Amino acid sequence: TDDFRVLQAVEQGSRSHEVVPTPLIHQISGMRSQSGTNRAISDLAKLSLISKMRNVKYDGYRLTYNGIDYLALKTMLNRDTVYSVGNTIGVGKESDIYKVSDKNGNPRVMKIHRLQGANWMHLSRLAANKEYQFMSMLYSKGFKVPEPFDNSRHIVVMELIEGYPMRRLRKHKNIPKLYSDLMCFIVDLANSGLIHCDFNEFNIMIKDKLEDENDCGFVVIDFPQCISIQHQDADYYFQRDVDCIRRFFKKKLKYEPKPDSSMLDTEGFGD
Amino acid sequence: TPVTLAKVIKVLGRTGSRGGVTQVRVEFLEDTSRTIVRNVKGPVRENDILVLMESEREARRLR
Amino acid sequence: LDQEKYDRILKEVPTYRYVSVSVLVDRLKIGGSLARIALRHLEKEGIIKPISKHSKQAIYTRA
C-alpha cells in the first residue's frame, strides 16, 4: 500500500512542472530520510523506470515508458482488474495488444498505448480516453462490439472474444441474410452519422455460438477510420464499404445482390 | 472548347507545400498583350509553349 | 454440328476487314486452338491473306 502510494505521489509529482529534478522527488514523496527516496529512484533507474537528465547546474529525472504501468496496475488494483501479465497477440501501430488474466482467472486484453517526458505518455492517455469514449458511444448506441472494462490512464483493458477473421471463413449457409446484414449495418452507420471506411475483411469478426439455434453476433474494430458524413469525401467512403462487401461476396461467397444496394443519396434521408 | 495557347517567358521559382508546382509568367500566344501568371505541374524551360484553358484566372500564392 | 459452325467462318471473314487470332475466336462458336487451324486453312483457300505471322499472333486480311 505504502510504496504504491508514494509511487502514486511521484506520479502526482509529474503534473506540476516539466522534467522533474531530484529534490522534488525527495520532497513530493515527503518520506523520512535519504534512504527511501534515493534507493527508490535507483530501483527506478536500474529497472529503466526513470532516467537522469543532467542539464548544466541542473539534475533532473526523465520518466520513460517503463515506470508508469505499475501505477496503472495499481490503478487497476483499485478497479478489480488484471493480476497476471503477458501473452503477445498483435503488435499494432498505436498500441501493443497482450493477453492477460485477472485474479478471477478470466483472460482479458491489455492494449498498452505508446504514441519523451510528458507528450508520449499524455498522447497515449488522450488516445486511450478517446477510444474508450468511442467504445462507450458504440455500446450506448447498441453496436455489437467488445465490452470495455477500463482505460487505466493510457492502457485499455477489455475482454477477449472467441472470433476469427473472415479471410479464413469459406462461407455460411445463410449468405443473402449475411449480405442484408452487411448492407443494413452500414445503413445503421450512416444513421449514426458515421462511415467506417476500412470495412475490410480483416475488420469483421464473427463469434460462432451453435449450428442449430443460430444466435451469434459480430465485432467491428475500425477506430482510426470512422469519418462523419459531413466531411468532404464520405460518398465514395460509404460506396467503398458497400462495394468491398459486394466484391468480397462475389469473389469469396459468389453472391450477387438481387436488391440494389444503398447509395449515399439513399442514406441522406436517414439520420 | 476554348484551347488557350500560351508561352512560357519568365519562371518565378518553385512553390507548393511539397515544393513541386511552378509559378510561370505567360505570354499569351494568340494575343501578345496578355501576360498571365499561371501554375504549372512539371518540367518547364524558358520559351516553352503551354496549353491553358482560361487566360483570365490568376492565383496569388500556394502552400 | 459441322454445317452450322464452319460456313459462318466463310461469311464472317470476307465481312471483317481485319482477321487475326483473337478477332476470330470472338464469334463464340469455336475454341482458340482450332481457330488457327481455320486461319491456315483460309490461307490455303485464299480468303485470308497473310500480312505478318508470329507463333502467338498472326495478322491477316479478307479477300
Binding site: - | - | 454440328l1 459441322d2 454445317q3 464452319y6 482450332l34 487451324i37 481455320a38 491456315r40 486453312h41
Partner: protein, 104 residues
C-alpha cells in the same frame, strides 16, 4: 491444318473407369481428370495405344477407350516399365502397382 468437321457424332461427357471424363479437352488432359492418372501417364498410355493426342476426347472411339483400359490393367506387359508406376516394389505382394482412381 485441315478443318476436319464432324456432323455431331461426339459425346459431351464420357465415362470411363467408373469416373466422368469431359469429352472436350485433349485426351491426355481429359484422362488426367481421374485419380491415379496424371499428364505424362495418360500421355505414355495413349502413345502405347498410338492415340492421336492432338485430337479431343469427343472424337475418340470407345475401342481406343478399351485399349487405354487394357493398358490400365496391363502397364508392365505393354513396355511401360517399373519406374513409371505408382506403387513400385510393394511390401504386401512385392510387385509393382499403378493404383487407379476409385480403387484407392
Amino acid at each position: 491444318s485441315l478443318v476436319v468437321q464432324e456432323q455431331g457424332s461426339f459425346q459431351h461427357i464420357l465415362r470411363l473407369l467408373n469416373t466422368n471424363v469431359d469429352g472436350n479437352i485433349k485426351i491426355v488432359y481429359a484422362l488426367t481428370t481421374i485419380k491415379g492418372v496424371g499428364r505424362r501417364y495418360s500421355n505414355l498410355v495413349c502413345k502405347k495405344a498410338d492415340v492421336d493426342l492432338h485430337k479431343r476426347a469427343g472424337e475418340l472411339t470407345q475401342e481406343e477407350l478399351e485399349r487405354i483400359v487394357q493398358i490400365m490393367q496391363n502397364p508392365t506387359h505393354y513396355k511401360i516399365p517399373a519406374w513409371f508406376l505408382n506403387r513400385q516394389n510393394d511390401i504386401t505382394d512385392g510387385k509393382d502397382y499403378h493404383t487407379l482412381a476409385n480403387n484407392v
